[PDB]
Design a binder for this molecule. Sequence first.
Ligand SMILES: [Mg+2]
Ligand SMILES: [Mg+2]
Ligand SMILES: [Mg+2]
Ligand SMILES: [Mg+2]
Ligand SMILES: [Mg+2]
Ligand SMILES: [Mg+2]
Ligand SMILES: [Mg+2]
Ligand SMILES: [Mg+2]
Ligand SMILES: [Mg+2]
Ligand SMILES: [Mg+2]
Ligand SMILES: [Mg+2]
Ligand SMILES: [Mg+2]
Lengths: 136, 177, 50, 84, 116
Amino acid sequence: MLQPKRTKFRKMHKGRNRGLAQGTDVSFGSFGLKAVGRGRLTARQIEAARRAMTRAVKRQGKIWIRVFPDKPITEKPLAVRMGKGKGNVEYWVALIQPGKVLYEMDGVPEELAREAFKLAAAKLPIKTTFVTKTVM
Amino acid sequence: AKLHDYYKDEVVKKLMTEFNYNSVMQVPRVEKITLNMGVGEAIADKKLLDNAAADLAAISGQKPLITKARKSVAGFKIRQGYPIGCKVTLRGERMWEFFERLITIAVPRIRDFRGLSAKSFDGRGNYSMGVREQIIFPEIDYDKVDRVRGLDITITTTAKSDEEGRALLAAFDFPFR
Amino acid sequence: GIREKIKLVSSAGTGHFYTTTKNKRTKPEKLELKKFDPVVRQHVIYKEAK
Amino acid sequence: AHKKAGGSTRNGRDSEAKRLGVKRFGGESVLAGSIIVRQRGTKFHAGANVGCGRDHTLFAKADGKVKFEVKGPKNRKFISIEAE
Amino acid sequence: DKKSARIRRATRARRKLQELGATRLVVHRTPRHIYAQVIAPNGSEVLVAASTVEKAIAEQLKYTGNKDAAAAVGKAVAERALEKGIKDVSFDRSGFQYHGRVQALADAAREAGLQF
RNA sequence: CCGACUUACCAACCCGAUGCAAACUGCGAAUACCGGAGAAUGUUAUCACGGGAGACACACGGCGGGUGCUAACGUCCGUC
RNA sequence: UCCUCCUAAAGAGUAACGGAGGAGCACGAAGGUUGGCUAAUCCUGGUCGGACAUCAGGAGGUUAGUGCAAUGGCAUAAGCCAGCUUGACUGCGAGCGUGACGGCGCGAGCAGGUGCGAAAGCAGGUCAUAGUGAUCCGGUGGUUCUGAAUGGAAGGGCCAUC
RNA sequence: UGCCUGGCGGCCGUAGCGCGGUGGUCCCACCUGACCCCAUGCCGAACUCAGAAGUGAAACGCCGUAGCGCCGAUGGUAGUGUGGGGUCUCCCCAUGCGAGAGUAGGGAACUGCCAGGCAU
Ligand SMILES: [Mg+2]
Ligand SMILES: [Mg+2]
Ligand SMILES: [Mg+2]
Ligand SMILES: [Mg+2]
Ligand SMILES: [Mg+2]
Ligand SMILES: [Mg+2]
Ligand SMILES: [Mg+2]
Ligand SMILES: [Mg+2]
Ligand SMILES: [Mg+2]
Ligand SMILES: [Mg+2]
Ligand SMILES: [Mg+2]
Ligand SMILES: [Mg+2]
């Protein structure tokens, strides 16, 4: 369960998920999972994908999480009316723009890394793709 | 200046010959002697600090500086602005007189003597030391002082390094190993 | 609201006065200040009153 | 119950807007005493023919044309007036 | 250090004089010499100057760096300013205290005629 | 009497590579606003004073947001 | 009710039972002025003394400090220290900002009488923005005003105050 | 007129740091002494006074050198005003404006008044 250890404030505005991404390159490993669509990744979603992806490669190589849930999401309880202040923080999410690399992988063959990212992307709401490192 | 004159006639040239200094004032000279003594118990008794201040004015003929807390530290129960220490700085003839008095009379009078350490030069050549007991100075009348109270002696020198610092101290027959 | 309003009356005897506040639990001594007297158009001693 | 009673917020407070900012911009022709900028602190410093009040209000000490400029080693923003 | 501290001391009087737009008599002091310049309000041009590094002043001065040297240079600088037509200036001690030669120079200027 | 080393432990500060921010800014637009000048156009369209009002329950749509679930023909603001 | 920040869309202003915090004071010095001074933190060395007290040097450069929240500001310091002192002055007030209004705020300069400084100058409270309550009704002091036939007086008015 | 130096500015990092070298005729700085003028919560360290023996060490000035700081295009990208579209949590088209970062590069300041010293 990825989550900031402490925060300056406990609630944040809804905001908008606009623009393209920063960090669209495979900077740490050799292979990567790149987000094609935009949306929200919950810490549970990110962690479930990480379990499948690290277990797929039989605990070999190295696994990098490139995204962090830093945006808290509040939800009003069931059967409460509108107003009476903002809701309580239920979970955390990261905002995802098209092109952002979500996971990186190294130390394993490309055919195995491709299969591992397939299982991992089965857990994510956003469309993904397989990318490799390139020399700029 | 009975050791200031002693300095300028042989010690300056002595360092000159053995260190190949380009100019004579490159030979270092001690600029000041700082007499520090932090009581640390004025919080328990304000009145022991004035007596301590009188003690340091006897050993060296100067009125000491009463230092302030400068910051609140809860580990020692001090609040800033509280008198916590005693300080004197001596330069020139008064500095030389205290220096010769220390080395000739007092330093021999150190109990359980083994000399003085040569590694406490802070890396920049400035010596600092602590004497364990205070009766060693004849200025204070034995049996008239309430308690033994040591202090720290730091020799701040123009020397930029400990190697030439040791040359200055040794040329004064300072007690090195 | 520990500080309480006090009146400073001129020693020139013209009845003019200023008003201010003083903490009386500490500094219990009287307040004295050379202040301008608009009536005699001079600076005179003002003494605590009220 | 049929409805769940809510809580209460604790953040309802705010203070009035103080109408700060620049009153006359560059090129304005002002009379003496005209307020140029109302400030918290000295974001703009007083230049020639410009005075600074107790709350750091910059005002014209002469008739003329307002000019903003950057001067000094610290690149601070000064307001001066060309007398016209 | 030393020169930096002196500039920080002088800065407030220097900037206040610049704001007032007053002709400013700047005094400089060194252990061997003392310097004085009358500076135009715009601050870039000088109008008159007098110093103890000067052929005319040195022969009379027994030893430069004295209060009598300050009196000589003050009278000299004051007469030069007077004969050019400058009569009202503002003193700028340039971060020095108004005690010795700065006070001596100012005192010398008073009798000869400057208004400050 | 002050010492000199060592190992696969923890490891702060620091360096290199990565992201995030309404209550971060060593950067920074487009617009909007204020002022000066010039032409053309506009039934003075502008200001001031005075006689008379009504109105102070708004609605949806676009764009920028808070709240809600980027739920609501929801709710609360800005602007058209 | 008031102050600070965000929402608030780079002028002003801008709502919600939106997100966060404070005020109902304090100080005759913590104000005025003159002179002087410059931190946090870390390393090295040093009696008790150690992670952390006072001391010396170095690095570093405001990462400190501001009587109290937050924002903006502050080295020419608005931060720290000392001497002297009461301008925390009286009558005004060009002009301007901000409010539907009541009102609130800024202000050079003029007059009188002051303080500090050699002088140029600075000073009409405090680094600024909260620390607050209309009118009526009364209380107190003064007053070149009024005084129900006249001279007083009561009462009223004006000014200063509760 | 050339160089060196001091003061007061312009300007506000292309100008500031670091590293290396270089200067004492004059100047500058260190420096000598101090009942004294004056000063230290003590201290002639700083401030002050009386001086010029020594020295350019530090500092300061100057010269050189990119390990930094800094400045920095062209192109592209982000955004965005107006008008129009779509698969409308976000985009696209016409047109106008057009960053930030980064890159190639630049870069060891330039300059004004006066005063002094050396040289012509
Ligand atoms: Mg709150
Ligand atoms: Mg209504
Ligand atoms: Mg309504
Ligand atoms: Mg509406
Ligand atoms: Mg509706
Ligand atoms: Mg606005
Ligand atoms: Mg706007
Ligand atoms: Mg204060
Ligand atoms: Mg009658
Ligand atoms: Mg471009
Ligand atoms: Mg650019
Ligand atoms: Mg760039």
